[PDB]
Amino acid sequence: KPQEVRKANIIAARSVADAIRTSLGPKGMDKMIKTSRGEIIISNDGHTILKQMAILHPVARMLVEVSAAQDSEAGDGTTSVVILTGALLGAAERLLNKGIHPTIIADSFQSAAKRSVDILLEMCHKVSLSDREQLVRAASTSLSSKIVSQYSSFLAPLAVDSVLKISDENSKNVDLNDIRLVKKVGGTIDDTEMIDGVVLTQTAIKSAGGPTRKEKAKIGLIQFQISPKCNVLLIQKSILRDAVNDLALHFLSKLNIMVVKDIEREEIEFLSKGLGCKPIADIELFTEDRLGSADLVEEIDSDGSKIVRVTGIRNNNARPTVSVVIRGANNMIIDETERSLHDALCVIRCLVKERGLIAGGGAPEIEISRRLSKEARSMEGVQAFIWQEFASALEVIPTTLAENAGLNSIKVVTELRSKHENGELNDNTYEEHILQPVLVSTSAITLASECVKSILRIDDIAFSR
Amino acid sequence: PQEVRKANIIAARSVADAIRTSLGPKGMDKMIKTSRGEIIISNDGHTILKQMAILHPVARMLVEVSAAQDSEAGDGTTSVVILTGALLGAAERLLNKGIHPTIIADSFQSAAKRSVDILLEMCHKVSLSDREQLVRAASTSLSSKIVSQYSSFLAPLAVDSVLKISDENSKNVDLNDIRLVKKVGGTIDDTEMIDGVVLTQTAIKSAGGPTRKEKAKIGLIQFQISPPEERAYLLNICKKIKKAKCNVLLIQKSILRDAVNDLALHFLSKLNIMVVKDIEREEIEFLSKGLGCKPIADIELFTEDRLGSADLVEEIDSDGSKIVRVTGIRNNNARPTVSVVIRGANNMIIDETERSLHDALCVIRCLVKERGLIAGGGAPEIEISRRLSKEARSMEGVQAFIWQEFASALEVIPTTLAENAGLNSIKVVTELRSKHENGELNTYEEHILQPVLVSTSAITLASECVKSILRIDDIAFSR
Amino acid sequence: HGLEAKKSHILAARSVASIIKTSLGPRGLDKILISPDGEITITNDGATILSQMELDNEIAKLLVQLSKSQDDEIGDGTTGVVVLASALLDQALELIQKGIHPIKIANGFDEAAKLAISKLEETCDDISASNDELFRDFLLRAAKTSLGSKIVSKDHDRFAEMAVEAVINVMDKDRKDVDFDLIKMQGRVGGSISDSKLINGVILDKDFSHPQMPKCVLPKEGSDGVKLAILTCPFEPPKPKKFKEMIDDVKKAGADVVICQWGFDDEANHLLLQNDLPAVRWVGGQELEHIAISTNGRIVPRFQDLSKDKLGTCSRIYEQEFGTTKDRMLIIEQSKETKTVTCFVRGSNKMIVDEAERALHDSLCVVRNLVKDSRVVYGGGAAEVTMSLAVSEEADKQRGIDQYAFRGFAQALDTIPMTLAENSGLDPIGTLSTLKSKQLKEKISNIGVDCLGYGSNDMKELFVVDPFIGKKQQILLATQLCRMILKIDNVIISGKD
Amino acid sequence: NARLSAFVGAIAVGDLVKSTLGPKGMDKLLQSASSNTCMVTNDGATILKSIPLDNPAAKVLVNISKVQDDEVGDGTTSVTVLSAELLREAEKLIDQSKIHPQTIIEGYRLASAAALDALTKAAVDNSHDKTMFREDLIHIAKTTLSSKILSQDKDHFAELATNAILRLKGSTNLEHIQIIKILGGKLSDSFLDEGFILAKKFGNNQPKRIENAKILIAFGINTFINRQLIYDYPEQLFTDLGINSIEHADFEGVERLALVTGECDVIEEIMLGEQPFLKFSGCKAGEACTIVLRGATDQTLDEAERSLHDALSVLSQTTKETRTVLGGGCAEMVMSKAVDTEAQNIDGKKSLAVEAFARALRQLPTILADNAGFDSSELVSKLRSSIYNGISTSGLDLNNGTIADMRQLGIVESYKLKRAVVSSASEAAEVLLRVDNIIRARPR
């Protein structure tokens, strides 16, 4: 029974989706997870639940990879994509009882996903990146879900102005890993410096002889360490042996060469991209062509930070990589602010790759299910019946939102089909400032079609070592 | 389907090997204790297989084969079981070679027919006109019985009895028409042929009974003389018998009522009508054949045309016997039969004497169907294997290997004869095959002879038995 | 309880319904059944199969209770209602999990059923108002569908006309009332089906007592019908709580044959033989009523109350020998239309007689609904597909909670064409989607699943019609049954003492 | 659950009679609780009726076998085995072959027409030279007497049944031939007599030979016949009046007398087997014959009764249909070619259903070679290659083991017998394929 073995994995996969189903939305139910090490963590984020769940089931681990790609591409909807995946698995259970092979089930999802996107783009309102008033109100609403509210007014133009410089035109995917959120102890939320050139994670030399400032400097990346025309050099942090000898600090001080040591190993790959330089393993291969370009290098300390900033890289291959600096008093300030602004950059990232926006709250899922139900008569054969089950599987997202909010399940869903007939995208979430970008709803359906496909295509599993 | 046949062959081989030890007079006797507590001891194969109450369905067929062995040939009831198991034991290796039992069964029938012609060519041709070999055949067969010196006079009495009913082309003759009546008293030296008929009982011992009558009619009557004034009811019964002039009345024995009332004895005494009562049910069919009469249920069915004729009906005076004899039945339609009276002082005499005469009449009857005799002692079993040795090379196909195994199974009979006698099994058999280059059938000087029908029927019955054993591929419960 | 029985009632109905799913249609299963009275027959009729099924679950007992009342109205729609009612329970199970009360499902199917009736009437066609010349061919070919699965299919052309006259005679054009008690179904062993004749009157299984009595009754020089005597009192001299005086009352009244409920003496056959007056003995009480109605007679309680007006008059009375059977029954016909019609079928085997008898009785029930409503609809799956597309389209226009109750009703109607497609060797999903495309983009028509082998769609050319009152009766009983099942949330089964 | 029990349960029915098919077949033994009722017989109708079966689907084949026994009386084993082979292959047609069950039914319907057309094209009859037609009746009688003890003397019995049917010239009714079984003598001593031997005598004491007798079933009659017994006084009064009364005439004896006479020239009384017999002579256009079989025991006669009755029932049908076909595995081989011939143009779902019927036609001769001691897969495959393309004459030989002609060996079959087997077996298989569930009412 090769199909019955797969049905056992489908039931186990739907059980995971039912656990995440209660956590959907800000009013969703939290989940308590106790790790084997003894750490007790709790949260409503579906991405953090599936990461620490330590699923031993081979097929159920696909939801973790989809949730990882959901946050890496769209950045939002990691919880809803798991529920949407379980809906197609439940709809395919009745298909297997009718004698339908999963290939037709998987192939029809490709035509259903591409059709759902084209229908979604018809009702979507196309927006342009040249309008700065739309991007401020879009990121400001995403910051209302956190403790910081009144201080988020100055954080809205911070995320908008950083993307517009690197957006250009027809950039398609824009990696947010190049945008670094600098978390330093001290200061306040209202104190922020863009410093579009670059921002490091480390301080300067506190010993005697260190210039700490240099004009017209070339910054290279050196993975080597000095232990028993380059103005500024970087030394990789190594706790095993000594990084930079005290005698070497006095030697380079006479040569008017600024030294910054103890560079974090995580930022080595980050600085090799935005600065457009190359890592130098050995001094024998160390040349001038691998250096950077900096007009002025200075160390500016607001309060206690003692951080060095660089501006005007002016590199042809490299681009204006911007690092955002975040200040705050308590540790819980710069932390929650980091995750809040990270989700704001993901919403802006969705508008750059795909223009247009829609109103959230399960509004498009109702009309798409209505249009696909009427268009199902245009097809013929087994594929025609799949369009009817695919439309019913899209109604689980708006139904769960009504269940987790305390409202009547079946009553609110009927009110959606009734109001959406006369009006178009009017139900009002636009007056409530609820805006979900179209790329999130597009990626949630696209990744669900590939996730359910990779499930049904497994007809058996055996021990392999 | 082989698991059903292999289970039946092994179960039947254990039965044949158990009876194998009983072959010969020196063989091992088998004991059977019935559930009622009775224990019997004897070497007879027909008695052991009958009282064994075998639950195995196929093994019960050996009883029917042993029954036809004694009914046709009259000898070899133990040998036919050994020969049957010899073919079953040889068939075990045949199934291991992938041979279907149809070829195994069809080859035994073809080998049995060819084995008859081989024995007839080596057999001594004799005829029934010579009484020299007929007397010596029955006399030497009684050396295994209590009778020894008196067996010399019993041989010619059995020869002349068969020669009358044998004729020429009659071939098989029913042995049930020969009745041996045993009675206490007298001796073996006193014998009377009485070709007319002999009854099993005495006559009326009451007062008035004539017990003897001359020129009387004999007929079977199922009626009974009983009371319902009573003498008037019995007078009409005796008057209707006088109408047909029937002076001999035979009443079937029944425990319901009596036979003849004492008041009717005085009525029949004046008419000189002899009455013989207590006629057994087995003799009802016997008297209806030799006498040519018919059983008469009622008094109206009694007619003169169904009555026979009797020269003289008398009751012979003897010690503790009083046997009634009838001579001169004078019936052209009914053929005569032989009924011999057996007398003796001890009850154990007249018992075994009757059984001893059974084996003497069968061997003589074997010469009636097929003339000639073959010396026993393993001679016919080895002689067939000698001829099949060179004939097996002339065959082709699967059957060629069957002829070699068929001759090997025939060696079991002479091997058992050497084992039960205490002599070495293989050593005696090799000495017989060594002299086979000179001598052939040579036991002739020891006055030990065997008829050809026993050796012929033993092969024929065993060939069909084993043939029917392999035909059962399944055992089902059907009620 | 609530969380328990509501789930168990759905699984209990699917177990019994799944047995008869493969038995639906002419391609279904003929099941072997053995009655406790000793009668053995083989038929696919759902009313007989469901009645023989006896189980302790209370959900399936409602199927027998509904089929018992439906047997008198139709009797051939037992397999259609159970499958349709089970499809409503399957869609009701999903509505319960969505938070919809079970009483809403009962009221949801009520408005959905009445809405689908008006949609079917608009697409319905009429016979008498369209083509009168084909009115004869409609009744003849309607019985051919039910007789195609039986040995009758060879001789079906002869029995097609017999079922038409039997229904019309027992009914009136204006009233359109047909009773099963007025139609007698009888048969005996021996002969073949080609010798079966239609009888306009009772049977009584009478040999006319002594054989010297005349086996045929003459009109006696143009008299009025054939007068028969009906006696509610036994034949015997009067005693407080004579044969020549009682026979004179029959001769003066002119009754040729005398029918009585009790036996007669041997002297009765001697006096009735000289006057050529056959006698009838041992007639049941129910058979006495059918004689006076067909022969236009009266019930005479006493001996001296006889008269020419109270004697039933028929066309003639003759005794026709049937094969080698020693029964030698009677046939009483009538020239005028009577209220009693007796069907008589012969067969070479006892199982063949009962097989063709109930097969002919099913044809009488189909024609009964065809004459009740002149308007007929196209069956074979085309009725369920047409009624489903109308409800599914109007479901979006009807808002509220009942919007999902209307969508589930449309999907429940699709079970019938998918069930017939599974028994016909075709894709149930592929055929269902094909039938919807032919009735939408091309033109509005009725095209059902093919019960008989053919090479294309559009069975309308084959002129296969079903009665509108028959199909409407099925959806009403299926809706009424589905509501009643939802009204029982608890099953109380007492033990045994 | 029901389909698994109906398919396996019906195969077990065919596995009981699988050894009773063919002249080389084997005998089946049965044992009851009393153990003394065990009887060895190869009769297929006796095995099916005696063995009780709790399977309701298996009881269907029992009643169908009774209908086949009434028409002919032989070939009932081949009908059950052929119906079992269709169900054994149907298990593979459903599960792994993806075929609708009704398609399997429609597949056998289209395949049955091809099997009947193969027998029609292979049916050859000779109207001229009645001596050649008489030899065909001899060869058919040898196949009917097969599998029975009579096969020994069957060579002598071949002319007994052949010459008996030629003396009828009339209706196929078997009431003209009366079978009398007397103990004693070899089986080869049986003879054919048209004199209507009667097993009962007449009167108490009356003359045996009667001349110019007038037979009257109940006037100036010399012979009287009564169904009941006779009282004593009139039995004596009938003798003085010259009227001979016959008694103990059953319903079967009266029907045989109505087909002969009335008057008769000579009534002679003979004595055979120790019982009075009556041999009539000088009837008026006598169509009736009497076959007297002499057996050794009652068990031999009881098996010979139905053996001769079934052999004459097939020869009686050969008068209406003179077409004959070649048997001994050749008839089933020719029909196997017509199935694959019509398989060239066929639908997708019906292809494997009809092709499975072709292999089922070769399963009947496969068992015939099993009980013959030969190799079925080796011998049938060699014959199938010759029958494949043209030149179809020879067929399976159960004796020598090679490929020999059935016409030269004298093995032929009747056309009416084969068309009845292919029909009844096809209708028997369609009933069991339809039933996926069995529901039994609660008994009382």
PDB file of C-alpha atoms in Angstrom, chain C residues 188 203-212 215 318-331 344:
ATOM      1  CA  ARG C 188     -48.526 -20.533 -11.323  1.00  0.00           C
ATOM      2  CA  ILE C 203     -59.871 -15.961 -10.309  1.00  0.00           C
ATOM      3  CA  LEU C 204     -60.846 -17.882  -7.138  1.00  0.00           C
ATOM      4  CA  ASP C 205     -58.849 -20.960  -8.269  1.00  0.00           C
ATOM      5  CA  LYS C 206     -61.948 -23.070  -8.906  1.00  0.00           C
ATOM      6  CA  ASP C 207     -62.131 -26.296 -10.924  1.00  0.00           C
ATOM      7  CA  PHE C 208     -65.970 -26.156 -11.127  1.00  0.00           C
ATOM      8  CA  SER C 209     -66.166 -29.145  -8.732  1.00  0.00           C
ATOM      9  CA  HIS C 210     -67.482 -32.192 -10.640  1.00  0.00           C
ATOM     10  CA  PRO C 211     -66.044 -32.422 -14.184  1.00  0.00           C
ATOM     11  CA  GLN C 212     -69.392 -33.248 -15.828  1.00  0.00           C
ATOM     12  CA  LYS C 215     -66.773 -25.703 -18.385  1.00  0.00           C
ATOM     13  CA  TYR C 318     -65.185 -20.371 -19.205  1.00  0.00           C
ATOM     14  CA  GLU C 319     -62.578 -22.843 -17.947  1.00  0.00           C
ATOM     15  CA  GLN C 320     -59.374 -22.753 -20.011  1.00  0.00           C
ATOM     16  CA  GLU C 321     -56.845 -25.527 -19.431  1.00  0.00           C
ATOM     17  CA  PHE C 322     -53.338 -24.142 -18.863  1.00  0.00           C
ATOM     18  CA  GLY C 323     -50.593 -26.541 -19.929  1.00  0.00           C
ATOM     19  CA  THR C 324     -50.383 -29.765 -17.945  1.00  0.00           C
ATOM     20  CA  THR C 325     -51.398 -28.083 -14.672  1.00  0.00           C
ATOM     21  CA  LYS C 326     -54.246 -29.947 -12.967  1.00  0.00           C
ATOM     22  CA  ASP C 327     -55.649 -26.781 -11.356  1.00  0.00           C
ATOM     23  CA  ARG C 328     -57.737 -25.740 -14.398  1.00  0.00           C
ATOM     24  CA  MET C 329     -58.800 -22.345 -13.087  1.00  0.00           C
ATOM     25  CA  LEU C 330     -61.482 -19.989 -14.435  1.00  0.00           C
ATOM     26  CA  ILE C 331     -61.449 -16.682 -16.317  1.00  0.00           C
ATOM     27  CA  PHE C 344     -51.858 -13.726 -14.842  1.00  0.00           C
TER      28      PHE C 344
END
